């Protein structure tokens, strides 16, 4: 059934699974019209489909042309997400197809279930975890490829860079969710922590900076402090 | 006007005949029911005084044979049985009618309730949902499960209602996933009406039969089927006008007849709220919406 704090280690076992986050699929800017009404302008979006064991990210860029002449776009966005996830699964060799797909938002369950009818053995699960994957567009290289797209495109990344050479998947996922939670809570402060030092660079083939083990401890501690601060700055504590 | 006579009544029992019911005492001199209107199916049903577990009963049509009820002390129930000798039957019945040992089907002349509840119900269709081909009548009880319930365990004792499942390949055309899930018209009109039921009369007949089994026996899988068949129509944007108007009449009489005290278990809040207030057909069921609001405003 649902994925929660009690079955958290299941994410790192050897059954292939994927998280799907649709938060950033349909993105708009709201603005005033000349007549003083309000209108939206869509910008490019993305489906965030992530294997939490290996770090493999299937970033399907959603180009604004997919919304042209369509109605009820927030509803359509869930179905388009499910269409593209189903297309991705069908494109993978059988031995790479997931056994489970975990959606971060319960509204994706029916769309994905219906699109996956041909795969009755792939379990579609919700989660009780509040995962911070909406902040994926705070990762500069991901935001850049989404905004620059002129047509629908799939881009593959490893969201863990080379971390799995040194740490386990469990620890890598914990680091990723800490970084993303920080970026979600105070993006400016998080980016300052990461990228305030120009001497600590991001490899061309990576998303995050090339921190040593000891620098990651310092970074991770700075991210926790940021989240706790914002939690206080918020509720006043 | 036909007659379902009874060998005897050895155990105390509440006997139903269609929407009517009467209590018979242990060994009371009761020999059956007369004046049964010809032209409709009927159901004769039972609830024992000592064990309200298992309401059970028999669907029959007197045009198809001469039937009688006899208590079996081995299986412990009132059984329907057909009499193949027409003279013996006329002779046993006339004797029973002369001794005034039969209750009269108590139909008020103005009253069309039973016709309205069974308008599309045919015995030949009942006998395909309830499979026991050696008899012309059909046994149903509170506990019998449906084909669909069993798939999710004795097949010979099942209710073979048409399986309806909104998240199934049958309901969803490849390439029309969102379209078919949000508007069930292709599943209703092509798959079910044109393909399986052949016409709306057979569809309504199964819906009406499912309701009657839910009401008279508390049969849970029948209630599931009744609600699924309502939801499939209401969740379709394209439904022939004659079907929507007929559905409103069908449901109106079903809601009218339902015991006020059974609404908590026989009515699914989600389906009814969706059907009357959110669905494509939210404005096409005026009579049903009006009776539901005045009789069960809590559910909504
Ligand atoms: N035993 C016995 C029978 C009956 O009591 C009976 C009663 C009503 C009608 C037909 C009947 N036939 C029988 O074989």
């Amino acid at each position: 059934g649902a994925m929660n704090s009690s079955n958290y280690a299941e994410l790192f076992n050897n059954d292939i699974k994927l998280f799907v986050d649709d938060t950033n699929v349909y993105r708009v800017t709201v603005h005033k019209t000349f007549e003083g009404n309000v209108a939206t302008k869509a910008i490019n979006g993305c489906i965030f489909t992530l294997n939490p064991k290996t770090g493999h990210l299937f970033l399907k860029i959603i180009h604004t042309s997919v919304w042209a002449g369509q109605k009820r776009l927030s509803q359509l966005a869930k179905w388009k997400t499910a269409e593209e996830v189903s297309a991705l699964v069908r494109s993978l060799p059988k031995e790479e197809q997931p056994k489970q797909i975990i959606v971060t938002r319960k509204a994706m369950l029916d769309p994905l279930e219906v699109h996956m009818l041909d795969f009755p053995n792939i379990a579609i699960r919700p989660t009780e975890l509040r995962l911070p994957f909406s902040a994926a567009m705070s990762i500069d290289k991901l935001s850049d490829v989404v905004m620059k797209a002129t047509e629908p495109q799939m881009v593959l990344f490893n969201i863990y860079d080379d971390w799995l050479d040194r740490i386990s998947s469990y620890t890598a996922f914990s680091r990723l969710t800490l970084l993303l939670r920080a970026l979600k809570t105070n993006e400016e402060s998080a980016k300052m922590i990461l990228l305030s030092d120009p001497t600590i660079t991001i490899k061309s083939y990576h998303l995050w900076p090339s921190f040593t083990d000891e620098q990651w401890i310092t970074i991770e501690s700075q991210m926790r402090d940021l989240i706790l601060t914002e939690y206080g700055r918020k509720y006043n504590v | 006007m036909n007659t379902v006579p009874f060998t005897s009544a050895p155990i105390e029992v509440t006997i139903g005949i269609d929407q009517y019911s009467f209590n018979v005492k242990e060994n009371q001199p009761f020999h059956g029911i007369k004046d049964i209107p010809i032209g409709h199916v009927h159901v004769i049903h039972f609830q024992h005084a000592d064990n309200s577990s298992m309401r059970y009963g028999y669907w029959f049509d007197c045009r198809m044979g001469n039937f009688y009820i006899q208590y079996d002390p081995k299986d412990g129930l009132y059984k329907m049985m057909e009499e193949r000798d027409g003279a013996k039957f006329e002779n046993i019945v006339h004797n029973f009618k002369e001794r005034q040992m039969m209750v009269s089907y108590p139909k008020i002349d103005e009253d069309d309730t039973w016709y309205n509840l069974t308008e599309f119900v045919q015995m030949d269709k009942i006998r395909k949902i309830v499979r026991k081909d050696e008899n012309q009548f059909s046994y149903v009880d509170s506990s019998m499960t449906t084909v669909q319930e069993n798939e999710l365990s004795d097949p010979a004792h099942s209710l073979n209602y048409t399986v309806i499942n909104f998240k199934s390949r049958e309901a969803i055309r490849p390439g029309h996933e969102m379209e078919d899930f949000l508007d069930k018209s292709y599943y209703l009109n092509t798959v079910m009406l044109q393909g399986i039921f052949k016409n709306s009369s057979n569809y309504f007949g199964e819906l009406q039969f499912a309701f009657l089994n839910a009401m008279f026996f508390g049969n849970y899988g029948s209630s599931l089927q009744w609600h699924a068949m309502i939801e499939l129509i209401c969740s379709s944007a394209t439904v022939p006008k004659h079907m929507l108007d007929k559905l409103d009449e069908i449901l109106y009489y079903q809601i009218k007849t339902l015991p006020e005290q059974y609404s908590d278990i026989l009515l699914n809040e989600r389906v009814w709220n969706i059907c009357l207030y959110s669905s494509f057909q939210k404005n096409s069921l005026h009579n049903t919406e009006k009776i539901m609001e005045n009789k069960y405003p809590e559910l909504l």
Side-chain angles (χ1 to χ4, degrees), chain A, chain B residues 1-151 154-300:
Chain A
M3 207 273 300
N4 56 28
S5 294
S6 308
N7 54 30
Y8 189 74
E10 184 175 9
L11 296 177
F12 315 109
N13 76 12
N14 290 83
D15 285 355
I16 300 178
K17 45 181 70 63
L18 296 171
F19 279 112
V20 172
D21 183 90
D22 69 319
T23 305
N24 288 305
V25 170
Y26 174 49
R27 298 208 285 166
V28 295
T29 52
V30 182
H31 64 87
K32 280 284 194 55
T33 73
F34 180 84
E35 296 82 29
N37 304 131
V38 173
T40 57
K41 186 188 159 303
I43 62 169
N44 288 341
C46 60
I47 303 164
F48 180 94
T49 297
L50 168 67
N51 185 325
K53 175 90 175 181
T54 62
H56 286 207
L57 173 60
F58 299 87
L59 195 76
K60 176 66 192 222
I61 303 180
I62 303 297
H63 186 264
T64 54
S65 65
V66 308
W67 313 125
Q70 307 297 320
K71 275 119 183 63
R72 297 187 51 85
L73 297 184
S74 64
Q75 173 179 79
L76 177 60
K78 300 172 201 315
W79 291 87
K80 176 56 170 188
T81 300
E83 189 188 343
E84 291 294 344
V85 170
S86 168
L88 165 66
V89 168
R90 289 171 213 280
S91 80
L92 290 165
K94 188 193 198 210
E95 67 278 4
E96 298 180 35
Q97 293 173 339
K99 299 292 166 133
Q100 307 175 8
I101 297 168
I102 305 163
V103 300
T104 63
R105 307 200 292 174
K106 302 190 203 72
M108 281 298 313
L109 286 168
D110 278 348
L112 193 56
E113 169 171 2
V114 169
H115 272 279
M116 300 288 294
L117 286 175
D118 290 337
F119 293 97
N121 293 346
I122 301 189
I124 310 298
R125 306 175 54 203
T127 182
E128 296 293 0
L129 305 186
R130 46 270 184 176
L131 291 164
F133 297 147
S134 72
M137 289 298 94
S138 297
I139 301 176
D140 286 329
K141 284 185 193 191
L142 303 184
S143 183
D144 282 354
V145 69
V146 167
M147 288 314 283
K148 293 193 217 296
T150 59
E151 46 185 333
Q153 175 176 0
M154 170 74 82
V155 188
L156 310 181
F157 297 87
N158 190 320
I159 208 167
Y160 293 159
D161 291 342
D162 65 342
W163 302 342
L164 293 180
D165 297 343
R166 305 193 64 85
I167 64 183
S168 63
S169 297
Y170 181 110
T171 302
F173 190 77
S174 294
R175 178 182 292 162
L176 176 67
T177 60
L178 174 63
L179 292 169
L180 291 178
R181 177 64 60 200
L183 292 159
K184 188 170 178 166
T185 317
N186 194 327
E187 179 178 43
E188 185 221 302
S189 304
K191 293 193 178 201
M192 283 182 60
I193 297 171
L194 287 164
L195 329 173
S196 81
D197 211 317
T199 81
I200 309 165
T201 45
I202 303 167
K203 298 288 150 291
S204 58
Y205 51 86
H206 282 173
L207 293 178
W208 310 97
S210 304
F211 288 121
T212 66
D213 293 3
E214 298 307 301
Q215 287 173 348
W216 269 123
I217 303 293
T218 307
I219 291 297
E220 288 161 339
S221 315
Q222 284 169 13
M223 289 305 183
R224 287 189 297 267
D225 294 339
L226 177 164
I227 294 163
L228 178 63
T229 297
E230 281 311 314
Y231 177 99
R233 272 180 95 240
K234 193 203 238 202
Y235 306 93
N236 302 308
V237 164
Chain B
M1 310 301 274
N2 275 124
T3 302
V4 172
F6 274 55
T7 300
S8 64
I11 70 168
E12 191 170 309
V13 62
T14 304
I15 300 176
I17 173 84
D18 301 350
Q19 75 271 35
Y20 308 113
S21 80
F22 51 94
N23 301 313
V24 177
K25 295 299 171 295
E26 179 186 313
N27 288 315
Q28 170 182 327
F30 172 81
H31 292 271
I33 303 170
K34 61 180 199 172
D35 302 325
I36 301 169
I38 310 168
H40 313 285
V41 308
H42 297 285
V43 60
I44 187 172
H45 44 107
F46 301 91
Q47 189 145 227
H48 297 183
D50 70 356
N51 175 253
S52 57
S53 307
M54 188 189 54
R55 280 180 266 164
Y56 60 98
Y58 306 88
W59 289 95
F60 66 96
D61 183 335
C62 286
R63 299 172 287 188
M64 293 169 63
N66 294 320
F67 313 111
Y68 70 96
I69 297 300
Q70 165 181 106
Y71 185 71
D72 172 11
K74 174 160 169 81
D75 293 342
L77 76 175
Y78 286 96
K79 292 189 161 166
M80 181 164 277
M81 284 164 185
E82 173 176 324
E83 180 49 74
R84 103 147 283 119
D85 174 339
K88 164 168 190 209
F89 186 74
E90 283 190 342
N91 177 247
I92 279 219
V93 163
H94 175 265
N95 167 106
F96 288 158
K97 276 203 196 164
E98 277 300 291
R99 310 225 291 152
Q100 300 194 39
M101 288 292 132
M102 302 194 173
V103 295
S104 172
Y105 187 94
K107 193 188 163 301
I108 300 317
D109 312 303
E110 157 198 64
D111 180 32
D112 265 351
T113 293
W114 190 247
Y115 171 79
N116 292 335
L117 289 169
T118 66
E119 176 172 4
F120 301 99
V121 182
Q122 310 173 281
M123 261 315 306
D124 72 277
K125 299 305 193 312
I126 293 174
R127 293 185 70 239
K128 297 173 198 307
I129 298 164
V130 187
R131 309 194 161 292
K132 193 164 202 271
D133 288 344
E134 66 269 22
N135 300 329
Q136 294 287 289
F137 49 85
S138 301
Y139 171 91
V140 181
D141 70 26
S142 295
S143 78
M144 280 167 59
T145 52
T146 69
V147 160
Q148 173 169 63
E149 281 179 313
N150 294 342
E151 299 166 352
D154 181 13
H157 210 42
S158 297
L159 293 165
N160 300 275
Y161 294 120
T162 293
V163 174
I164 297 178
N165 175 359
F166 299 139
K167 296 189 282 181
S168 72
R169 175 54 65 218
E170 292 73 27
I172 303 293
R173 282 177 298 177
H176 309 251
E177 283 82 6
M178 180 189 200
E179 168 178 27
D180 285 351
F181 184 73
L182 291 178
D183 174 7
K184 315 208 186 275
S185 299
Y186 185 85
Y187 192 28
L188 174 67
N189 289 302
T190 299
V191 179
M192 287 284 157
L193 289 173
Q194 173 179 291
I196 295 183
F197 285 98
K198 307 307 181 184
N199 58 62
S200 58
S201 296
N202 295 333
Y203 186 99
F204 286 146
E206 184 169 326
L207 180 160
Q208 291 183 309
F209 183 57
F211 169 78
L212 295 166
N213 289 322
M215 181 171 63
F216 288 127
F217 308 113
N219 186 270
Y220 178 75
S222 296
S223 182
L224 289 183
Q225 181 73 12
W226 179 54
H227 287 91
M229 300 188 75
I230 298 171
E231 188 166 1
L232 171 62
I233 294 174
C234 291
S235 294
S236 296
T238 307
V239 185
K241 306 86 169 55
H242 73 278
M243 269 187 83
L244 294 167
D245 286 336
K246 187 62 68 165
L247 181 61
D248 195 25
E249 296 302 321
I250 286 167
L251 301 178
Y252 171 84
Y253 285 103
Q254 292 172 338
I255 300 308
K256 180 172 173 63
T257 302
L258 266 181
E260 299 68 23
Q261 304 288 339
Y262 288 23
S263 51
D264 47 319
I265 52 188
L266 289 170
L267 294 172
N268 186 280
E269 182 185 65
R270 178 193 68 83
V271 170
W272 283 99
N273 273 277
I274 276 66
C275 288
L276 296 174
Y277 304 120
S278 332
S279 76
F280 286 109
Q281 304 306 339
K282 63 192 178 303
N283 292 322
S284 315
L285 310 171
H286 304 120
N287 297 346
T288 292
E289 181 172 289
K290 186 167 297 310
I291 197 184
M292 282 287 293
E293 291 183 356
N294 278 279
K295 189 179 183 191
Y296 301 117
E298 323 89 47
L299 197 79
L300 325 158

